């Protein structure tokens, strides 16, 4: 899977 | 009722889980649509829509029995139809007909599927997915895949109702809750761009007993107000808060929450920098002349140049921008495949890759690929490699300094500090007479359309990119295939298009890399297979076509979630992405409470994994 970020997630 | 309240930062381009390979879509759909199998809290693969399954003795035929109480619901919660085996036939045919961006997961695996996609045949009845009856779906593979069941946790293998799909036409899967049907733990009550995502527990979901929150509410977060996370947590509005140790507010936060700061583990999602090897779009640049643009085009194709950038990139300084000085290394990731992703006879993948580096040159002597440290940064080595690159490039007429464009969102304050760090590190080591990193601060729309949501390689408007990959299935190929010239999911980010390798791809050796992948993929013995993939990973590190940076996880938070209640998966979309299993509580968790829970989870995970391996043998028929 293509991801962005990293940012605040779960 | 019990609610989870927090933030989200990525709006989806669509809800089309059959056509998309972007996490912006699958992170959402994980909560709305189930497939055949899912994860428990320990990363085991457990029943989802399929209550039972078998695999043939030759490994080629997988048969799944769907539970009779699974239904499709509208976004309003009304029952539409039972889930049937035909829905899996419909889903795969639609993914093929739409040329799904995730077709690499199935096109070379399912019998007849490549022929159908490429037009050698026209009859989907010749493709290896069949509804034997309403409750029984059968897949036929071209070769055995021990990781096949793990692929069922990827959304391209999820079902869709054919009547709904036909009724919706081009409206299917748009960014609108009514564009899909729901068979998973939640219904989507709100999807508002740059505003909100809201989930509501579906009371009639087959596994509603495992959904412990009634509502999940996520407010949009653009990065301009990082202190808002702790502020709203402390005000009681958020269930959790990511902490930013660089904030001026952090000293007061650490005193107030001295016993509550929790650090997560690094996970299997890996980020890395890459170069645009064939840039066509120059809307966002500091270059003003064709000579500068051609010079950068030549430099990125030069291996010594890429290695010099690699050795000049201080990962500790980069991590410090988001984690603070003391946590700077907690997020560092030094391979694309995580170093512990698989093991070879007791030795982790990363140690095997390190042993293969002995044959890729003195510049790699002694390298250690463990998470949580920086084995790349070395100014003396970077300067020496750059001197070689400069001699090679000057002979072609290349002008120095080389200007490299890197984009960042104007609102993303932490991201701006990160890119400023790489600029300072690279320019300090190599000299601004040799390399300049030009930071382009862009609006949301400009950042999206020139990067993550660009639809072709030609629209990629940058020289350096910082994206990442989450694994889709339990094999090193999920990561390493993304740069293959035939179908690599990451090719467009490198400025390349899937198909025949062009002169840029051959200049950097990606044709050779692709042939290596094909040979490794033929190996069926796991130990030998993983050793071949370790050599491929080593080749890629040496090529410096990727500059490994960071993982997800390794970050501090405050929490009112119950430790280790949620699903966990090493691969796929049914772990942390899903709000199933997650529980909330009144008390702020303490560091000591979390540590006790973590030790219990680590112990139980090994026990449960061993049991899951024993359960597997019962399914061979």
Author numbering:
A (entry chain B): 1 to 10
B (entry chain A): 32 to 652
From the paper:
Given the auxotrophic nature of pneumococci for certain amino acids, the Ami ABC transporter system, orchestrating oligopeptide uptake, becomes indispensable in host compartments lacking amino acids. The system comprises five exposed Oligopeptide Binding Proteins (OBPs) and four proteins building the ABC transporter channel. Crucially, SBPs determine the specificity of their respective transport systems, thereby governing the range of molecules capable of entering the cell. The five lipoproteins exhibit pairwise sequence identity of ~52–60% and share a very similar overall folding.
To evaluate AliB’s capacity to recognize diverse peptides, the protein was incubated with an excess of defined synthesized peptides (peptides 2, 3 and 4) that were previously reported to bind AliB. Specifically, crystal structures of AliB in complex with peptide 2 (AIQSEKARKHN), peptide 3 (PIVGGHEGAGV), and peptide 4 (VMVKGPGPGREST) were solved at resolutions of 2.29 Å, 1.66 Å and 1.49 Å, respectively. The three complexes obtained for AliB exhibited minimal backbone changes among them (rmsd ranging between 0.1 and 0.3 Å). In all three complexes, mirroring the observation in the AliD:peptide 1 complex, the amine N-terminus of the oligopeptide establishes a salt-bridge with an aspartic residue (D503) and van der Waals interactions with the neighboring tryptophan residue (W500). The last AliB complex, AliB:peptide 4 (VMVKGPGPGREST), exhibits a recognition pattern akin to the description provided above for the initial three residues of the ligand. Nevertheless, two notable distinctions emerge compared to the previous cases. Firstly, a cis peptide bond is present at position 6 of the peptide, corresponding to a proline. Secondly, the electron density representing the last three peptide residues (EST) weakens significantly, indicating a lack of stabilization for the C-terminus of the ligand. Consequently, the first three positions of the oligopeptides precisely aligned with the AliB binding site, whereas beyond the fourth position, different conformations of the oligopeptide are observed.
